[PDB]
Structures are given as C-alpha cells and as structure tokens.
Amino acid sequence: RIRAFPMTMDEKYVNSIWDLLKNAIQEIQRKNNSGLSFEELYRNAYTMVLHKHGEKLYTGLREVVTEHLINKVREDVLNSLNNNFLQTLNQAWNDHQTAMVMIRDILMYMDRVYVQQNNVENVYNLGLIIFRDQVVRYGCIRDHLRQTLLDMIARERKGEVVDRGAIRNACQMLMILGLEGRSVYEEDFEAPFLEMSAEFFQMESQKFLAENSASVYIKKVEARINEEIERVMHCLDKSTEEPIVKVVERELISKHMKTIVEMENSGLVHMLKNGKTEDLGCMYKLFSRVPNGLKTMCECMSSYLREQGKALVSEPVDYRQGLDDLKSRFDRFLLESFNNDRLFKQTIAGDFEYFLNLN
C-alpha cells in the first residue's frame, strides 16, 4: 500500500547545504564553474526546497547575487566610465548572463517548485532585476550610458564613425532588462533619444528651408527617413522605427506643411505652373505620410485653380477651349502626380463646379 517517509531536516544541516551552494554560486560568479558537480549541487538545492527551506535558498541567492553585482561588477563599470565604458559594461553583462544560466540550472528545482508556489520572480528574472537596478540603472552608470549612446548617434549624424555594434549590444541589454518588455529601453534610451532627435530635426529643417528648394527639401526628408530607419536596423531596437519616423515626419513635414507647399518660386503652385509632374508626385508621396498633409496640398491647389478658373471665366470657341485645356491639364496632374486620389479629384471637381457656376 501507499507509503510515505517525510523527515525533519536539522537547522545545522540546512546551513551546511546553503554554505555549499553559497560557495558554488560565488565560484560560478568567479567563472570557476569547472570542477563543480551538477548532480551534487542540484541535489543540495533540491534537498533544501524539498524540506521546505526554499525561502532561505531564495533569500540567500538574492543576497549573494546583490553582494557580487554591487561590490565587484558595479565598481568595474564605475572605474571604466572614461576608459572603455561600453566594452566593460557589455563584458559585465555577458559575464552576468553566463553566470545566471548556470545558477538557474543548479537551482532548477527551486525554479519549478518554490518560485511557482510563492508568486516570486524566477532565478534568471531575479538576476536581471538585480543587474538592472544595481548596475545599468544605478545612477552614475545610467546617466553615462544615456550620455554615451546619445553622443554616438549625435556624432554619427555629424559625420563621425562610431561602433554601431556597441550601441546594438547596449540596446539589446536594455530590452532584456525590461523582463519581456520595453519599460527599461523606453525610459533610459528611447525617451531621451526621441527628445534629442526632435531638437536635431527641428534645426535640420530650419537650415534646409533657408537654402534649398521645395523639391530638394522633400528629397532630403525622404533621405533622413531612410537614414533613421537604417540606424534602427543596425543600432537600436526594431520597435523604435515607428516613433523615430513619426518624429522625422513631425519636425520635417507636419510643422512646415504650409511653408513647403507655398515656397516662393519652388512650391506646389510653381510646380503646377511649370508642369513639374515628378516633383508633385514626390510632394504627394511625402505629405500623404502625415495628417492634414494632402489637405494642405489640396487647399493650396484649390486657391490657385479657383484663381485661374475665375480669370478664365472672366477673360467664343477660344473661351470654351480655355476651360477644356485647364481641365485636361489638371486631369493629367491627378493621374500622373496625385495617384488619382479621391480628395484631389473632389477638390479639382469642386473648384471647377465653383467658377463654372460663377459666370
């Protein structure tokens, strides 16, 4: 029949088991994992959890990891602030990940029995929280990592050559420390990155509008969108593509919509007058990215087309041909440049229905 042999574990025996595991964890942190028997270390951690001493093992594990990352790892990163900071931080990050894998393996029974039962973070996630809080988001390190990464992106945009791999490793690290989330990456990197980028693009638009034509400006916005996407694919996290493109669109297009379209001797009306089909198509494609973009183009076109139409209905067969030549011209613009857009077609029709009813 069904048998059971539960035994009481002596307090002095629990301490000797923990002392053996504490030493093993410390030896793994020192990268001296060779010569350690997995089965005997697993069994010791198993015996502790099995005899309901999982809390002592969990509290102890949290203590040993914290002691190591504050007294050894934090100091190594703090001593490297002005001498290979990213190289030392990533080395500390790779050393932590390697150590935590072996530590979670030895305490595997605790990870499947104790952490599940007592609604606490698993060995690997606890290790990430301790690394995140005591190293990456400590203060001097957090501010310097933010200063380093942003200074590199600011330098790269100015023409300097930077280690893109070092940025990718730092961003990958900030993402993982988010614990299957982007909270750490968003707060520490993305938020100040979008702030300093918006300031850069605002000043970029100011220079380009002051010396380049509307056509050249539109080409330079497309070039900046592509440069910022290529930067996300090689340095940052894939989830930063939409927020950075939106900032490029806000600072280079949205905030200068009426300025670009009404640019004296280069804008929409100038393109309409000289029949610059390709340039209008490029304007349509760029302004269709932002809200009220095509509306601004339509309002600018409507004002001019109505002014031309009112001048045509005021000034026998030549008068009828004038309205037909104006219709054929804008029908070409609608198909060849405005991709036969419903809004542009309604505007062209609406303007024609206004001045043809006037006279």
Binding site: I2, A4, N33, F38
Partner: protein, 266 residues
C-alpha cells in the same frame, strides 16, 4: 506541386527501438548510478526532461566523467531497481505502469528528475485512490512533492476525521513540521481540545530522546483556553514534560488565571 508525408508508426518506432538499444547497451554514452548501473542515451534523457540538459552540457564535471551518481534517496540503497527501470523506460517510451506500492518511488523519481507529466499522473493516481485508510500517507507525499490539488483534498479529509486519524499509529510517524501545522490548523474537527494535548504527549513518547526538544513549541500551539480548568490542574500541570520547561509552567499558570477572570466578567 509539392506533397507532405507523415510516417504513421515513426513516432512509436523511434521510441521503442531506442529503448531496445538501451536494454542491449547499444550506442549508450551515459551511465546512471542509483548499486545497479543504468546505461542510457544522452540525447533521449536530455529530450525527456530539462534536468539532463546542464548535467550533460559540458560546463560541469559529469560531462567529462561519463557516469552520474544519483545519491541521497528516501531509502539507503536508492530506489527499487525495477522502479528506476520503469522511470528510465518512461523517458524513452512515455508508457509506465504505476501500482499502489511503487507510486511513492515513481513520484520521488518524477519530481526529482522534473518529469512534470509523470508527477501529474502520480498525483491523479493518488487522487482516485484517496481514502481514510491512506489519507495521512497521501498528504505527506502531496506536501513533500508539491501536489497542491492533492494536498488540499487529503488535508480536507484529515480535518474531518482528525479524531479517527489521531487514534491510528500512522499519525504518530509524521515529522515535527507536519504535527506543528496540524495543531496550528483551525478547521480540524476534534471532540475536545484536551484530546489534542493527549496526542502531543503520545507523539513525543514514541521517540523520547529525539522528540523531547519539540514539546515546548507544540505546547505553545495548544488552545489552553478551550480546555476545562479541572483537566488543566489534575492532568496537564502534573506531567513530567510540562514541569521541566519553565515557559510551559507559566503557560498553564496564565491559562488558570484567564478562566477565573472570564468567569467573573459574566
């Protein structure tokens, strides 16, 4: 056009053929010591449970040894060789026969080697076989090997027949931590709170030299207020185990004063 093929027997064939290789010791690369040694395949064991992955990884001593020594079991010369063979064959075939006499070792081997589905079956096997005759033994296994659903069902059965459980010798086999938990439990059904004190004295007397140190903590768990003042002076106070501990003397002294103060309050 392209077509997809699925071999109907391939799943069952691969498992049985690798198990026949193991029984013949063919292509085996690992030795499992429990004594009798069990030759097996690293690829199959690492596929059966997450436990063998770091053991045979290369970062630890065992990968360079080729033999793994499984020690510190419930029994001195390890679990039953036929039971170990059944658990190793399970890691290959996925099929196992569990009996009422082998369930405790199958559960010990499944829990230790993180065989979740086999641990679940053992829990479901003990759930269907749960009765007042084996409730104390099943609770001990469920509490030991974390079978929360089974532990609740077995505990809810003991809480109802505690008067019958404390009558049988099976309850006095239980270790201190379980005895302390049952005394701390408030939903347990007992005819009198005086019976609870009589069971503590019977438990300590079973192994006098090994359970005399636990009497002080167990006496503090007893509800002295619910017991009659006549029993507290004539049977509780003259006991040898209570007279030795000074804090246990003050506990029954404060209890007698509590009964006198409550009687005058009416």
């Amino acid at each position: 056009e392209a077509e997809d093929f699925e071999c109907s027997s391939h799943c069952s064939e691969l498992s049985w053929r690798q198990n026949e290789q193991r029984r013949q010791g063919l292509f085996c690369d690992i030795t499992l010591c429990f004594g009798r040694e069990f030759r097996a395949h690293r690829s199959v064991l690492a596929a059966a449970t997450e436990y063998f992955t770091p053991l045979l990884s290369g970062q630890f001593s065992e990968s360079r040894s080729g033999r793994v020594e499984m020690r510190k079991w419930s029994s001195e010369p390890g679990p039953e060789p036929d039971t170990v063979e059944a658990v190793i064959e399970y890691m290959y075939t996925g099929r196992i026969r569990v009996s009422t006499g082998s369930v405790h070792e199958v559960l010990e081997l499944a829990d230790r080697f993180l065989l979740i589905r086999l641990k679940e079956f053992c829990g479901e096997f003990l759930k269907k076989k749960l009765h007042l005759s084996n409730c104390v033994a099943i609770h001990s296994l469920a509490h030991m090997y974390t079978l929360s659903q089974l532990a609740l069902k077995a505990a809810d059965m003991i809480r109802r027949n505690f008067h019958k459980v404390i009558q049988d010798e099976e309850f006095y086999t239980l270790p201190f931590h379980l005895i302390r938990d049952w005394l701390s439990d408030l939903e347990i059904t007992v005819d009198s709170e005086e019976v609870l004190f009589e069971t503590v004295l019977k438990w300590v007397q079973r192994n006098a030299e090994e359970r005399e140190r636990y009497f002080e903590e167990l006496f503090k768990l007893l509800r002295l207020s619910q017991m009659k003042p006549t029993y507290l002076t004539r049977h509780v106070k003259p006991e040898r185990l209570v007279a030795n501990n000074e804090v246990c003397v003050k506990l029954v002294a404060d209890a007698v004063e509590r009964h006198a103060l409550r009687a005058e309050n009416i």
